[PDB]
């Protein structure tokens, strides 16, 4: 169907972090290169999203709001997939030039968060997720977190998000457990993103003390948008309760 054609056509390719793998693993080096991975993946997320079916239906500020709220889950989900398809979930495949082994999961001071992501990635295997189910699930994560007070044009958002749910059910089809399972997986992204939000926020606050570099858009998002989530003004949309 046309819908899948589009998701496959617009899917972003390979994004390198620019990490200097000659330097020793340090918290500051590992964290700075991850921050730079984020800024570069943010650009691709933007161009991907604008090309999504119906997305231009949203008020422009909603378009931007939804991107600035959901990029963490989006990116974590896609990295989980990469990890699964590249290294069979043994390591976290942030980028071809930034692969976390256990030592790096430790050196990043994010080890428990990393364990959760590896667990996510393991799920793609355990559940035999297909490329198409991946692609549709990922699209939905863009419409998975909104302000508690609603969006500028809430109706267009609701209808878009409904359609993306419909598409995921479609490319699924006792088939009942499947959907239970995929929604469940989708929900599980949310707590992980939440921890990373808490983590990146704390990190930015103190980053001058730890010589961690935050690029420009990352700095501003993390300080302007991310606290609206941490303070509870913006919350994920959970399938299950």
């Amino acid at each position: 169907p046309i819908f899948l054609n589009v998701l496959e056509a617009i899917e972003p390719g390979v994004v390198c972090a620019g990490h200097d793998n000659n330097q020793p693993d340090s918290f500051a080096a590992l964290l700075s290169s991850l921050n730079e991975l984020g800024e570069r993946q943010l650009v691709h997320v933007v161009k991907w999203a604008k090309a999504l079916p119906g997305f231009r239906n949203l008020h422009v500020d909603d378009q931007m709001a939804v991107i600035q709220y959901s990029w963490m889950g989006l990116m974590v989900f896609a990295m989980g997939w990469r990890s699964f398809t590249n290294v069979n979930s043994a390591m976290l495949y942030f980028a071809p030039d930034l692969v976390f082994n256990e030592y790096r999961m430790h050196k990043s001071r994010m080890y428990s968060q990393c364990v959760r992501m590896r667990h996510l990635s393991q799920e793609f295997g355990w559940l035999q997720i297909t490329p198409q189910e991946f692609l549709c699930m990922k699209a939905l994560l863009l419409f998975s977190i909104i302000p508690v007070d609603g969006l500028k044009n809430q109706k267009f958002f609701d209808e878009l998000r409904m359609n993306y749910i419909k598409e995921l059910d479609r490319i699924i089809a006792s088939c009942s457990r499947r959907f239970y399972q995929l929604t469940k997986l989708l929900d599980s992204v949310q707590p992980i993103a939440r921890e990373l939000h808490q983590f990146t926020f704390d990190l930015l606050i103190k980053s001058h003390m730890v010589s961690v570099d935050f690029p420009e858009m990352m700095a501003e998002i993390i300080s302007v948008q991310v606290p609206k989530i941490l303070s509870g003004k913006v919350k994920p949309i959970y399938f299950h309760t």
């Binding site: 378009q63 931007m64 501003e220 998002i221």
Partner: peptide, 8 residues
């Protein structure tokens, strides 16, 4: 913002 300027 750096994001909105880039976006638009």
């Amino acid at each position: 913002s750096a994001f909105s300027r880039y976006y638009t």
